[PDB]
Symmetry: C2
């Protein structure tokens, strides 16, 4: 299934994920593609911050959903 | 000085802050106005998440800037 990962700074990342992938997995997939270290990422769906160990299905994130990416970088 | 706090879910909060306010004071101000607990707030400027102990000025947040707000939610 296809999900868009949109940055607050503009850019849309398209990914092919499995419905049961953990959020940590999506992060590894973003790293795969963009090179942004998982540790640096914060994923958000419906205005909320998502947790690592949960799955896309747990959050009701379905085909064509949009997630947001925020960076958590050293020293603010 | 006037800044805006936009949610990732279409709501703009207009605030009057001092250029030297820490990020935690702005959260206290959002709480005062929207009732959202400071603990459930994550503030973002230019695609990156903000540290509670730094000031708006440390991040070069000037008049009319837009900050974003995400919730780091847990219980119920």
């Amino acid at each position: 299934m296809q999900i868009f990962v949109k940055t607050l700074t503009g850019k849309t990342i398209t990914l092919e994920v499995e419905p049961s992938d953990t959020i940590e997995n999506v992060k590894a997939k973003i790293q795969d593609k963009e090179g942004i270290p998982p540790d640096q990422q914060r994923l958000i769906f419906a205005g909320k911050q998502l947790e690592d160990g949960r799955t896309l299905s747990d959050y009701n994130i379905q085909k064509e959903s949009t997630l947001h990416l925020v960076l958590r970088l050293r020293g603010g």
